[PDB]
């Protein structure tokens, strides 16, 4: 019964605006603590990209936490790269960082990223 | 050596997952009341699509309201169709609601949707 108009750039515009909200710290509602470091983010975005975060915020004792500590074993530069991805679509992979990037994606239960890390050490010795 | 990979279906998969959260009422943080109807949503999604909602949740007396009442003149069906659009990309229009949809989009300061409505008044 409806004429439906799909806006092919909507999803990207939305994601772009979510990133501006992030970097202006608007409605951010949680801090992710990774060893030293702190990353402000929106819980819903986290939950929309990782089933790890989904399992966390879906716990009624944890829904309303405003701070979340990750595994001490986790690399802060790896998580920062994954966090920017989640907000931008762009995974910035270096020869220097890729090690921990992949351990993070794995930890954050995001295989499509794991797989592009493996599919990246094609350009390898 | 150095690199940057863009996942082209990522934005799309995020939006898809945001809409499942909504449809399961997971982390929704506001109810929008439009006459006698109520719609649960995520404030960040609202602010990421509508200029009106950006201003509401950016006023610090309102940032943390969990109920927002739209102007009484706003139509529940028109609102529903825009909220679905925010969460899916799909604007579902019919001849018997297209003008209400357009009025609502003006109010929510989503002007490209308004132009699309106007422009979809070719056949007609």
């Amino acid at each position: 019964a409806d004429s439906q108009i799909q806006f092919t750039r909507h999803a990207s515009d939305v994601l772009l605006n979510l990133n501006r909200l992030r970097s202006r710290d608007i409605l951010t509602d949680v801090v992710i603590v990774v060893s030293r470091e702190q990353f402000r983010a929106h819980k819903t975005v986290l939950m929309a990209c990782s089933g790890l975060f989904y399992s966390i915020f879906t716990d009624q004792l944890k829904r309303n936490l405003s701070v979340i500590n990750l595994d001490p074993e986790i690399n802060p530069e790896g998580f920062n790269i994954l966090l920017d991805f989640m907000y931008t679509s762009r995974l910035n992979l270096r020869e220097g960082n890729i090690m921990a990037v992949m351990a993070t994606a794995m930890y954050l239960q995001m295989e499509h990223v794991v797989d592009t890390c493996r599919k990246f050490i094609k350009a390898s010795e | 050596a150095d690199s940057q990979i863009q996942f082209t279906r990522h934005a799309s998969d995020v939006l898809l997952n945001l809409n499942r959260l909504r449809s399961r009422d997971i982390l929704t943080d506001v109810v929008i009341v439009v006459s006698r109807e109520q719609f649960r949503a995520h404030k960040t999604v609202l602010m990421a699509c509508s200029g009106l909602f950006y201003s509401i949740f950016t006023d610090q007396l309102k940032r943390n309201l969990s109920v927002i009442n739209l102007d009484p003149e706003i139509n529940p069906e028109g609102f529903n169709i825009l909220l679905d659009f925010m969460y899916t990309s799909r604007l579902n229009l019919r001849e018997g609601n297209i003008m209400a949809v357009m009025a609502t989009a003006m109010y929510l300061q989503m002007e490209h949707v308004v132009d699309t409505c106007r422009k979809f008044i070719k056949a007609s």
């Binding site: 439906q4 806006f7 | 950006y54 300061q109 989503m110 490209h112």
Partner: peptide, 16 residues
């Protein structure tokens, strides 16, 4: 039918 639109959003979260 399902027509496509290519319009970018007119809404841009302010940078200040």
């Amino acid at each position: 039918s399902e027509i496509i639109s290519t319009a970018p959003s007119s809404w841009v979260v302010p940078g200040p």
